[PDB]
Every structure is written in structure tokens, then in C-alpha cells.
Amino acid sequence: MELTPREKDKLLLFTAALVAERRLARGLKLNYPESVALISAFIMEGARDGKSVASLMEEGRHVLTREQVMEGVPEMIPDIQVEATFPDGSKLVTVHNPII
């Protein structure tokens, strides 16, 4: 595999997201780190699929709603950023006010 440090670092995000994903499924209102992890993993998989930066910047705002997260969490996350390898290399995705 020859995994570089950044690929291994992203495995941490992926795993943090598996935690949140399971909790959401049980019907829990997600907390701060859970929300960030869940929305971030979504975007990375978006790039894997080959979606464009512009598309993800939009789709990212429709992953979790204000009624799926704990009180105050939406305000604790003014935006979310994550990079991933798109077909045309690494690109930065910024989702402003992801939770509404």
C-alpha cells in the first residue's frame, strides 16, 4: 500500500465517522466531534466518486439538519473543510454553515 502519513491520518477521520454514523442510526442527536466527522467523511467519499468541488460544497449542507444534532452544535461549526484526492488531484472543499 505504501501509505503516506496523510493517508493514515485520513483513516482517523474515516473511523471517527464510523462512530457517528452508528450513533445517528440509533437515533441519537449527534454532538460536535460526531457531526464534523460525519459530514467530513461524506465529502471525502464524494471526491472518490468523482464529484466536483462545487457540487460537494452544496451537498455538504444537506447531510445533517438542526434537529439531528445537540443544542448549540450548529453554531459551533460555522463551516467544515476537508481535502481529498479528486480525479484531478487534491482539492479543498469548504462547506459554510453545514448544519441548518
- Contacting residue, 31, 59, 61, 68, with another protein by CB under 8 A: 31
Torsion angles phi and psi, residue 58, rounded to 5: -90, -55
Does 18 engage in binding with another protein (CB under 8 A)? no
Chain-centroid distance, C-alpha 6: 16
**Nearest distance from C-beta of residue 5 to another protein, angstroms:** 5
- Contacting residue, 6, 11, 55, 75, with its own copies by CB under 8 A: 11
Query: Which of the choices another protein, its own copies, none does residue 62 contact, using the CB cut-off of 5 to 8 A by kind?
Result: none
String marking each residue 30-69 x if it binds its own copies according to CB under 8 A:
--xx--xx-------x--xx--------------------
CB 80 within 8 A of CB 60: yes
CB 69 within 8 A of CB 30: yes
Helix axes 32-49, 5-26, angle to 10 degrees: 120
